[PDB]
Amino acid sequence: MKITVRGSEMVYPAAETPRRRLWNSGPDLVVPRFHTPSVYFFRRRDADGNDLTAADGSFFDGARMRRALAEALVPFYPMAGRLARDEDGRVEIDCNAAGVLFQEADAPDATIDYFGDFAPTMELKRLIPTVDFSDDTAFPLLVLQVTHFKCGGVAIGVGMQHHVADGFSGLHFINSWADLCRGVPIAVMPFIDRSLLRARDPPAPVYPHVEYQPAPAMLTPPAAVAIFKLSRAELGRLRSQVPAREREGAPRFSTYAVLAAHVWRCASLARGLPADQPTKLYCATDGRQRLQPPLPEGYFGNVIFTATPLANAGTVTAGVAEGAAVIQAALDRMDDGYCRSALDYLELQPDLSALVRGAHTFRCPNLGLTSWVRLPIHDADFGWGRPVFMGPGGIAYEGLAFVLPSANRDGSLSVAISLQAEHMEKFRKLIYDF
């Protein structure tokens, strides 16, 4: 598919910004190392057919966007910084307003519909500017690219470095970028200081934090990527396979626990894991309302703690009910005490870059399932309308999956996932087999 770079320029903050070092919390430092690939799609028209082009005839005007960008780079000023170690080796952010990369591009021969279901395939990744990772102190924390398409359609490819923000804060920035570009003031100001997620003095962890321990191994084959939608009705059915035990007294399983158990099960069956094979499911968890007192809105960075349900495949593949209980218990266990204890625990390891989650974390027999269901991924209205889709621009690792809210409020959920190719073939036949 032919794509040309119309042009690229480093954008800089639209005012004075402190040239400080930013302390990175433990969570900021264990999330995966590179950039979070995100991709938006907008159509020139719809939903009825209405033209979305502005009065002034603009549709995603580069200059107007670089302008908002620069402005939003002021409160969110560390988005402009660079990665620096410290007097120890501990990665922190160097706020040096060295700017973010922005860049326009053209897809003259192809409509957006070329991407079909928008699976985070290899092809989709090209909508994002490529970074050179070989000098992590050099590359910008935020690369951007707005691609204009053969039928008036537009694609924003976002590449945000993990240390900087999680889905919540990252989307805070992007949505704020789109707010300015639309002529609206930022509703909530980023809190830049990540002091609130500092360990206790001295560290007193009360758990061994299974989430930071080495994933289970089997007692490299390239990976296929696909996306699977489950309607509100299918989700209902799946849920009904989970008998809400009256005699127990406990609350019903969350929808996540049910969907995740189903995915964990399909993945385990797809991979042909024998019954005694242990398997670990990684579930990124938002600590914003786990911690007490709650973090202040606008808190800027990662508040991601990790729930890792762990069981034998036999338990997981025996049914959704049994997997969901394991998952739901793992989740319920993430309270203020557990989260704060995880802070203390990370403060004790020597090199945190050994705890960074990567390919070793998520690959067979294990799994990651990251939910964006609660994230405002469809809020980015720059002035020309809400996107028709947003999701991961690629999936770096075999075994990693994402849950995505429906773009059109229809109550469906989509699962985007990378598996070994032979496993994916099976998985396609399993994921709806219920």
Ligand SMILES: CC(C)(COP(=O)(O)OP(=O)(O)OC[C@H]1O[C@@H](n2cnc3c(N)ncnc32)[C@H](O)[C@@H]1OP(=O)(O)O)[C@@H](O)C(=O)NCCC(=O)NCCS
């Ligand atoms: C905790 C987690 C495992 C489940 O997230 P969730 O989708 O909010 O659902 P939870 O299991 O936390 O919460 C329990 C239920 O209360 C619901 N709920 C409670 N308050 C809510 C709110 N303010 N908005 C939306 N849903 C809410 C949840 O949707 C969930 O599902 P249900 O519809 O089946 O009841 C985890 O996915 C999470 O914290 N997600 C939030 C965003 C996130 O994690 N981002 C990570 C990307 S870096």
Ligand SMILES: O=C(/C=C/c1ccc(O)cc1)O[C@@H]1CC(C(=O)O)=C[C@@H](O)[C@@H]1O
């Ligand atoms: O899910 C996020 C980030 C979300 C995001 C979304 C939009 C944006 O602009 C920035 C970040 O990161 C996640 C972090 C993670 C972990 O193990 O903690 C596993 C990965 O699956 C995810 O990539």
